[PDB]
Design a protein around this ligand. Structure first.
Ligand SMILES: O=C(O)CCC(=O)C(=O)O
Ligand SMILES: [Mn+2]
Length: 345
């Protein structure tokens, strides 16, 4: 239910580094530090691609589970995940998901080489394919603007983040939540996203809650194995209902942005409440290149790094341990690539 109104920004099509760009970047940073999230206005193309992707998702989800379950690959984690498979803080989650990772044909040199997680999306139909690809291209353009403004706002060289996101490992979760069916309303537990930057779109049903930064509340560093943020604060105020709003996307930082900024930005915790109707949403992750390593921006003498490909691959093997994708990584020793990439990229 509606409480807070989020701040809304209109991004320039191109970010050049002029003083107004820097001021806008500072305002985005401040909004994340106060509210944990903000809105960015969409134009006619951004909105059209959003609506067409949501419409394709709705059509696909009405297919029988036998067909949806066939949309899997043993090369990439792209494709279908049935409801009740994903687990957050020991409890299974309710949405069914189609993950879209980088769509690489078997003729790509990385797929020929057997790099872990590299392969073609198992698209369910051509309308779904075209809708998601064009939506993700548009989302990527916004991701790059946001990353240049964020660097500028921190008085960093304009290409600090975008140097890491060339051919970035961008991917998207296409979600459908069922209607509530019992007194249980926890659609997904409280958690933080593992990536760099998150851009989210939703239908008009409502159910996403986010947690702003809280004075006096210590936050875990979810990229470290003993400091999971899963389930933390789920039942503590404050949680901000993200009111469905036509003509916007929302944006919040992930774990990698928390890591690189040394906690000046916090990975925003979020959770979803089931509603009386099914609910559709998309979460887009604007990510480093598979071969890029994140590093702390404000501690130049720190050795800590996050190699992104290793980070992603470990996360997905642990989240979907029995997927055919994980089994083929283990069978073919595809993780061996990671050590050579760290040394000879
Ligand atoms: O449903 C949303 O709006 C947020 C995306 C989500 O549920 C997730 O964290 O995977
Ligand atoms: Mn999430």
């Amino acid at each position: 239910s509606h409480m807070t109104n989020l701040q809304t920004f209109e991004l320039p099509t191109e970010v050049t580094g002029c003083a107004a760009d820097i001021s806008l970047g500072r305002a985005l940073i401040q909004a994340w530090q106060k509210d944990g999230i903000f809105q960015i206005k969409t134009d006619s193309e951004q909105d059209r691609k959003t609506q067409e992707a949501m419409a394709a998702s709705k059509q696909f989800c009405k297919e029988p589970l036998t067909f949806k379950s066939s949309c899997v690959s043993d090369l990439t984690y792209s494709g279908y995940v049935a409801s009740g498979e994903e687990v957050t803080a020991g409890k299974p989650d309710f949405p069914e998901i189609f993950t879209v990772c980088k769509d690489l044909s078997v003729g790509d040199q990385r797929v020929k080489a057997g790099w872990p997680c590299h392969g073609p999306v198992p698209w369910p139909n051509n309308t779904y394919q075209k809708s998601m690809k064009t939506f993700m291209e548009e989302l990527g353009l916004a991701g790059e603007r946001l990353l240049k403004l964020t660097a500028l706002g921190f008085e960093l060289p304009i290409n600090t983040f975008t140097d890491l996101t060339r051919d970035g490992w961008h991917h998207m979760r296409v979600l459908r939540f069922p209607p509530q069916t019992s007194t249980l309303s926890r659609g997904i537990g409280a958690h933080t996203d593992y990536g760099l930057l998150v851009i989210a779109a939703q239908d008009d049903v409502g159910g996403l809650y986010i947690r702003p930064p809280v004075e006096g509340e210590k936050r875990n560093r979810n990229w470290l194995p003993g400091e999971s943020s899963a389930g933390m604060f789920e039942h503590d105020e404050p949680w901000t209902f993200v009111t469905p709003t036509p003509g916007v996307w929302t944006v919040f930082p992930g774990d990698i942005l928390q890591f690189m900024t040394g906690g000046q930005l916090l990975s925003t915790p979020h959770k979803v409440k089931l509603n009386t109707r099914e609910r559709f949403a998309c979460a887009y992750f604007h990510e480093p290149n598979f071969e890029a390593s994140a590093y702390p921006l404000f501690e130049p003498s720190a050795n800590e790094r996050i190699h992104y490909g290793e980070h992603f691959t470990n996360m997905f093997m642990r989240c979907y341990p029995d997927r055919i994708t994980t089994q083929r990584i283990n069978k073919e020793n595809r993780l061996a690539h990671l050590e050579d990439l760290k040394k000879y990229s």
